[PDB]
Every structure is written in structure tokens, then in C-alpha cells.
Design a protein around this ligand. Structure first.
Ligand code: ADP
Ligand code: ADP
Lengths: 50, 200, 243, 148, 88, 39, 150
């Protein structure tokens, strides 16, 4: 996925799971949350981007 | 598989880099020194933050003095830039009348569907060949030349016979009254050959 | 307005007539008379108007920009051989075998008529330019017509047409196109560059800037790339000797 | 040409278009090799294929209907006759495309025949003002002008 | 138009020795007034003109010309017809 | 499918102040003299 | 017309079955400087019908960019992208079509050259994945290896 498209789609997906209150819900800025999660998963070597 | 080939070519890059080392004397000394230093570098714990930002005893060369703090170099915000621009959100509506007459004339163009309907009806009631002049007298055209062209067009579309050498004329007044005389090809519009054809 | 058109006829030869025979989609015989004051041509798209225009330019230039109106400066799909073959876009060839195609135009200056002509024919089923046989006609004689030339060709080969020219006053004919074009240019006292510009006008279309207008439409380039190539080669010989 | 033929994928192929019988494999048409140079047929063919491709691109996978229905077009109609232009509009509507047609004040009649609305634009020197109308309001304004 | 008129005039001639000019797709990409100005410029240069059009700008051509040639095609065959008009 | 019917346009091109288009979802054209602001 | 300090606006709108979508933009200059980088941009995306270019321009004149992004955060059904790539990514997400779709749309919008069919495809229809640079890299690697051999 191109990174911008990936992060936008991720911020869309995470919004669906705000209904899943049992785990973290971003109160104010879902886009920041998606960007942070992409950074984190790159940090864990789950996703490598080139 | 292309991804692996990229790594192989990359490695060949460094192989090529290390092939060419027939250094001059001074180049050779500095090359020894640099290779030693780089080998020493690998063993440092790069990932740690504090290792990377530690100072080194390298001497200062190329030193530049700058930013001499003379108070007389001070300048201050000047507020002459406050020229305001109005926010003209008003609707800059149009004026239909100003539009040129040519626009309306094109807006008055010949309608082919209505013309086809009217011509077919007239020829059906007339149940005989009807020349262009006879059609003009039987049906006063608005865009005279446009209807002439479209009538010859249906004629050719239906295969109706036309002779161009022998001629015939029809007079018509235009939108401003000025009269004209046409020279036209002899032919007869036949209704049956026309209704059988589709039009658009 | 159109009164100045007659003044142009006094100042110049203005062209108002056409004779055609088996050109493109115009099968059999067809003809057109045109008003001295100016004229229009019309019809449904893809019916043969640009075909007629190309018919006109075939008589006037060694090579025109066929259907240049459609392309906008790009290569023409068509050419003389396709028009004389009655190509229609791929039975699609109306004239596959030994056939003929005649085209002519007429003019007038101060009541004096001048008619150009071109008798074309394939003596073979192959459609190469070599197989493309032709004869070109320049006429100051009103009595010489494309129908007369077609009849004479029907009587026999080009020798009957050249013999007809010898027998006929105020007529010239040329189985070689460039001779006919030179005759036409000499008559009108202007070089072929004027006809090339006319053909550019025949398909005048888009561009991108004022500079492009001049550079492409107005002027003829004659860039010196051949001169540079020969200079480079001679200098390479000089470099050999110097080495 | 050779470099593109080698290293550029699409140039390795020649594109051809044909007209097919609805009920059978029968085919009589081919736009390839010799374009035919038709001054009206090439335009309609190109606009039609372009509209179809553009619709396919515009339609999210699975759906046969474009999600962004709007398209922009131009004087391809001017190169086209009335009948072929009507074919163009019919094809455009059938592919699920709503469209906007721009023209410099001509070919009004077929637009009125196969479109509902229009917008007018002005030039009053170095300025331009534009208003949205229905065909009937424009017709009534024309009638008002014709009276006086 | 200027360049073609100037080229077509022999040396020193203020008017051409060949005044005919062809224009296929005469005004496909222009408005009515612009085409009228084009014909006016042609008048300034004193050139006989020929315009081709797939049934557009009939208003302008009718206002500015005096004859027409009809083009039609049935299948693979095409034919023409001649038409004219004059002011009384 | 979504259909474009608006253009609110301000200080753009030869359009001083505010302007507005109402394209129609039923099939529309936009028209103006050569050099009027269509393109 | 507006050589000096100015503000510019654009706002298209579309609907499907009574639901609005509105593409927006703002382009203002703080001075006469007209270089491409001098242009201060702020894209906008909103489906809330109440949002209009008129409202955005009013908010701009009242405050500025600092107020504009604050308006987006305080508002609902509205977004602002201080860069274009993010804006177009969002838009492509909403319309669920690749960038090739929009690019082909624009290519077709002004298609007047309108030449033979083979050029229609290669130029407009098909996305571009040519292989010139990759062949150059292959040649470079082969030449390096030949250098080793020599
Ligand atoms: N010489 C030819 N070569 C290829 N196709 C031709 C030729 N002559 C006619 N055709 C066909 O017959 C029609 C001729 O109409 P044409 O005048 O060339 O187009 P337009 O009127 O738009 O300029 C076209 O539809 C074309 O397909
Ligand atoms: N570079 C430009 N050249 C000519 N006009 C321009 C230019 N830039 C802006 N304009 C303004 O915007 C308009 C652009 O021309 P336009 O009428 O839209 O083209 P078209 O005639 O094809 O519709 C012009 O009417 C003019 O007011």
C-alpha cells in the first residue's frame, strides 16, 4: 500500500473499532492514532516500508 | 525474485568499491587509517542514543566565526502591511440580454427531429414527389439554408434520385425581411422512401 | 461583403468548379459548381467532405498533408493510393483491380478560365506508388475538361492524351508531376512554398503559443543538421590526420 | 521506437477495436493498422472507448456502476455530427456516467434534445459572470428578446 | 491568412494572383463572432474562401456565403449536390 | 453514484468576487463566448 | 487582477440520493510574491451541507489558517489537509478508486488531439510501468561485474 493510502485506510478501520471500547479508543484524532500504530508496527518489524 | 537480484547487485557494488585500491602513498596511509577506524566503529553499540551523540576529539578546521552581535543590526516589525482587502462575497450575477445575438441565433438552430416529423407529414399528405422549391412554398423554413441541406440530406439518405445539372429556383424572405433567390437541384421528395428510414 | 470577391477575381484566378471520377467514396462521375462570392461544403461527419478537400490538394502539391484536419500535424492515415483504391477502413477497397480515377478544378481571372487536371489509374491490382500511374494536366483552354480527358484515356493510353494536347490549343500535360507543378508555379509567378503554406492552411489546427504560430505555420525551417553531420565527418577525418 | 518496443510493455502490443454483432460472433469493423482516417467515425470510436475505460476505472471493483459519475467533455461533439453526437450521449448515459458538456456557443439543438440544464458565462472585458438556467427559462428569455 | 495572402501575391502585387483559400473544419473550435471576424479579415485580404463544416455555424455561413455543396454517403458510396442563393 | 451539481468559486481565473454554478444531475451543458471562462 | 495580497477559493459538490460531498480548497498570498512555493494552500473535505466556500472564506477573513484548522477540529463532517497528497488519498478512499482513475479522467477531459486509436491507449488509457531505469540498472551491474573481471 502507498503509505498515505495505508494510513488513511487504517484510520478508517480503527474508527470502526471505537465501538470496541474494551481496548484503546482514540478520543480526539483517529488519524494520529493510525499514524502512531503504523510507526509502532514498523518498529516491531511487522511492516517494512520501501 | 527481483528483490534478491537487487541485493546481489548491491553486494557486487561494494565488491567493485574494494577492488580499486592501488592507492598513492598518502592515500594508502589514510586508507589504512580509515579501514582501522571503521573496523573499530562496528563494535560500538550504535542503537543506543548516547553513543551516537558523544563528542570526538577531531580538531576544528574550516572554523567560521559568525553572528557578531552588533546591536545596530536590529530592525523591527513595521505595520504598513495592514492594507485590507474586502471580502466581496456578493453574487456577481449575469445579464442575459447583453449576450450577443449570434448566441440566440445558434440557440434558434434548426431542429432536425421536428423538421423530419413535419416534412414526413407534409409529404405523406401530398402523396407525390415534392421538389425543394415546392417544399419551401408548402413549408416556410426558418433557417432556410439549414432546411435545404437537411432536405437534400433525407433525399440522399433515402436514395431518392437527384439531377444537379438541371435547376430550379425558390425565393424566401429572411428573419429581417430581406428577400433572396435560391438556385436548387431538381428532384422530387417521395414520402414512402422516407418514412421507412430511421432518423435521430 | 462578397463584392470584394469579384475584385479578387479581377486581381487573381479564383477557383470555382470541380470534376471528379471514382475519387475515394465518390464513385462514378460527380461534379460541383461553386459561387465566385465564396462557398461552403456540408454533410454528415464521415461522409466525404475531407475526402473532397484532399481531392483538391492532390492536384496542387507534389505531396499534401492528407486529412491534416483530423490529425493536427500528425501523419495522415490516407494517401493517393488509398483514395484511388477507394479505401473505406477495414470489400473495404472499392477499386481493387485495374481502375481509373480522374480529378480536376477550374478557375477564372477577368473571365479567363484555367483548369487543372489529373488522370490516375492502376494498370495492376497491386497498390504500390510505382503501380500508381498518373498524368497531370494544366489548361488555359476552357474547352478542355475532365470528362474529355477521361474519354480520351478510355480511347487509349497516355499517348492519346499527349497527342490530344499537341492537337489542342492552350493545353499542357505531364506524366511527371514535378513538371506540371513547375508549370503551375511559373504561371502564377510564385514558388511552391506558397502552395505548401496553402496546404498547411487546408488542415490548419491547434497550437500552444504565439511563438509556435510563426515557427510552424508561417515559416519554412531548412535547419542545417545535414551541414552539421558533414562538418562532423570531415572534422573526424581531420582528427585522424592530427592523431 | 525500438527502445520503447523493448523496455515499455504496452508498445509490445498493437491495439485494435472492432464492432460486434449483439446476437452472434459476426464482426465487420477494424480500427488497427489502417485507421481509415474517418473524420467522424474515429472521433466517436475514441470517445466511446475512452468513456467505457473511464467508467471501468471509476467503478469500485465488483460494481458495474461508477461511484464518481461525473465526466467532462468538449468539442468532440463539434467534430461529431448530430446523429453521432446523440450516439455519444446515449453511450455515455448507458455506461452509468453523468456528464458535463462544454462548447463555445454552438451545436445548441442536440444539447437541448438530450440534456436538461445549461449554464451561461459572460465576458465583459477582463471579467466573467455566469448563471445557471433550465432550457425553458433560456427559451423564454429568447422569446423576450425576440419581442424586443 | 496574412502570410498566405502575402506569399500568393507576385512581387510587388498588393493583391494575390491566386486568391482561393481552403478551410476544412472551418470553425470547429471557435464561436460565431470569432468566425465572423475571421471572414472579415479574409475580406480585408481579398481572398476567395471555401469553408467545410459538419453542420455547425449554419447561421454564420448563411450570413456570410452565397453557395453550398452537399455531401452524403450511403454505405461505401458518396455523392454531392450543388446549391446556391443570392440577395434580391 | 454521486453527481456534481455545484461550483462555489471565488477570486479564481477571470471570476472576481464570488460565483456559483448549478450543474444539473439530469444532464447538463455549460456555454459561453470564446474567452468567457469555460475552461 | 489580484497581484497583491489576496485569497482564492474553490468548492465543488456532488450528491448521491440526497447526501452531500464537498471538495474544497483555499489559496491566498500574503504579498506580491508569486513563486510556486510562496502559495499557501489548505485543502478541505466535507460532506456536511452547511460547509461552503463562502463560509470558509468568511472564517479565513475573520482569522486565518490558525483559525481554519481550529474550525475543522471544532467542526464535524469536515477535514483539512495542509498538503495535497493526504487530501487526494482521502478523496480516493471516499470514492474507492485509484489515482489512475482521476488522472485518466483529467487526460480525457481535454482530449482534443484525439489521434489514432493505438495512441489513445498507450497515452491515456493505460497506467505507466515502463522498464527503462531498470534496464539501465541491469547494465550498470553487468558493467561493474565486468570491471571486476578485468
Ligand atoms: N480514401 C479513404 N480512405 C479511408 N477511408 C475512407 C476513405 N474514403 C472514405 N472513407 C470512409 O468513408 C467516409 C469518408 O468521410 P470523410 O470525409 O473522410 O470524414 P469527415 O467528413 O468527417 O471529414 C468516412 O466515414 C471513411 O470511413
Ligand atoms: N493564460 C490565459 N490566457 C487567456 N485567458 C486567460 C488566461 N488565464 C486566465 N484567463 C482568463 O480566464 C479565461 C480562460 O479562457 P477560457 O474562456 O476559459 O477558454 P475557452 O474559450 O476554451 O473556454 C479567460 O476568459 C480569461 O478571462
Amino acid at each position: 500500500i502507498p503509505l498515505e493510502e495505508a494510513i488513511q485506510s487504517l484510520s478508517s478501520i480503527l474508527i470502526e473499532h471505537v465501538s470496541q471500547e474494551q481496548y484503546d479508543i482514540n478520543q480526539d484524532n483517529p488519524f494520529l492514532q493510525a499514524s502512531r500504530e503504523l510507526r509502532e508496527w514498523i518498529k516491531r518489524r511487522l511492516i517494512v516500508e520501501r | 525474485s527481483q528483490t534478491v537480484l537487487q541485493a546481489r547487485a548491491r553486494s557486487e557494488r561494494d565488491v567493485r568499491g574494494f577492488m580499486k585500491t592501488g592507492l598513492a602513498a598518502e592515500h594508502h596511509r589514510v586508507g589504512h587509517l580509515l579501514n582501522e577506524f571503521l573496523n573499530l566503529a562496528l563494535k560500538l553499540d550504535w542503537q543506543r542514543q548516547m553513543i551516537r551523540k558523544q563528542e570526538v576529539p577531531l580538531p576544528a578546521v574550516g572554523v567560521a566565526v559568525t553572528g557578531i552581535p552588533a546591536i545596530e543590526r536590529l530592525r523591527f516589525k513595521e505595520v504598513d502591511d495592514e492594507a485590507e482587502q474586502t471580502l466581496d462575497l456578493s453574487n456577481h450575477a449575469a445579464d442575459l440580454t447583453q449576450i450577443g445575438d449570434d448566441f440566440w441565433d445558434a440557440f434558434n438552430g434548426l431542429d432536425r427531429e421536428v423538421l423530419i416529423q413535419q416534412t414526413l407529414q407534409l409529404l405523406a399528405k401530398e402523396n407525390r414527389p415534392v421538389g425543394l422549391a415546392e417544399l419551401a412554398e408548402l413549408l416556410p423554413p426558418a433557417h432556410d439554408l439549414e432546411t435545404f441541406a437537411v432536405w437534400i440530406g433525407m433525399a440522399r439518405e433515402a436514395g431518392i434520385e437527384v439531377i444537379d445539372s438541371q435547376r430550379e429556383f425558390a425565393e424566401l424572405s429572411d428573419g429581417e425581411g430581406r428577400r433572396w433567390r435560391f438556385n436548387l437541384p431538381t428532384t422530387g421528395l417521395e414520402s414512402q422512401a422516407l418514412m421507412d428510414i430511421d432518423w435521430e | 461583403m462578397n463584392q470584394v470577391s469579384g475584385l479578387a477575381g479581377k486581381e487573381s484566378f479564383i477557383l470555382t468548379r470541380i470534376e471528379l471520377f471514382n475519387w475515394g467514396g465518390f464513385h462514378g462521375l460527380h461534379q460541383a459548381a461553386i459561387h465566385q462570392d465564396g462557398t461552403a461544403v456540408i454533410g454528415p461527419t464521415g461522409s466525404g467532405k475531407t475526402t473532397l478537400v484532399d481531392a483538391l490538394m492532390t492536384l496542387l502539391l507534389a505531396n499534401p498533408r492528407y486529412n491534416l484536419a483530423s490529425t493536427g500535424g500528425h501523419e495522415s492515415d490516407r494517401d493517393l493510393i488509398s483514395y484511388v483504391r477507394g479505401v473505406s477502413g477495414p470489400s473495404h477497397i472499392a477499386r481493387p483491380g485495374k481502375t481509373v480515377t480522374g480529378i480536376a478544378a477550374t478557375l477564372e481571372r477577368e473571365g479567363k478560365q484555367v483548369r487543372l487536371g489529373a488522370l490516375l489509374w492502376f494498370d495492376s491490382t497491386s497498390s504500390s506508388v510505382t503501380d500508381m500511374k498518373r498524368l497531370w494536366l494544366f489548361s488555359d483552354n476552357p474547352g478542355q475538361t475532365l470528362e474529355h480527358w477521361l474519354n480520351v484515356y478510355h480511347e487509349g493510353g497516355t499517348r492519346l492524351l499527349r497527342q490530344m494536347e499537341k492537337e489542342a490549343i492552350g493545353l499542357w500535360t505531364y506524366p511527371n508531376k514535378k513538371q506540371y507543378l513547375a508549370r503551375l508555379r511559373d504561371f502564377f509567378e510564385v514558388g511552391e512554398n506558397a502552395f505548401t503554406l496553402l496546404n498547411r492552411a487546408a488542415g490548419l489546427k491547434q497550437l500552444n503559443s504565439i511563438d509556435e504560430i510563426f515557427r510552424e505555420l508561417v515559416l519554412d525551417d531548412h535547419s542545417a543538421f545535414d551541414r552539421a553531420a558533414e562538418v562532423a565527418n570531415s572534422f573526424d577525418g581531420l582528427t585522424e590526420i592530427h592523431q | 521506437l525500438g527502445a520503447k518496443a523493448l523496455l515499455d510493455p504496452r508498445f509490445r502490443l498493437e491495439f485494435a477495436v472492432s464492432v460486434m454483432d449483439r446476437q452472434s460472433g459476426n464482426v465487420i469493423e477494424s480500427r488497427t493498422g489502417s485507421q481509415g482516417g474517418s473524420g467522424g467515425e474515429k472521433e466517436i470510436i475514441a470517445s466511446y472507448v475512452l468513456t467505457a475505460s473511464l467508467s471501468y476505472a471509476l467503478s469500485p471493483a465488483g460494481s458495474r456502476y461508477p461511484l464518481f459519475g461525473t465526466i467532462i467533455l468538449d468539442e468532440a461533439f463539434s467534430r461529431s455530427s448530430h446523429a453521432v453526437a446523440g450516439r455519444i450521449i446515449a453511450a455515455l448515459r448507458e455506461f452509468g456516467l453523468h456528464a458535463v458538456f462544454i462548447t463555445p456557443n454552438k451545436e445548441m439543438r442536440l444539447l437541448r434534445d438530450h440534456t436538461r440544464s445549461a449554464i451561461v458565462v459572460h465576458r465583459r472585458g477582463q471579467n466573467s459572470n455566469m448563471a445557471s438556467l433550465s432550457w425553458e427559462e433560456l427559451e423564454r428569455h429568447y422569446q423576450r428578446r425576440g419581442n424586443a
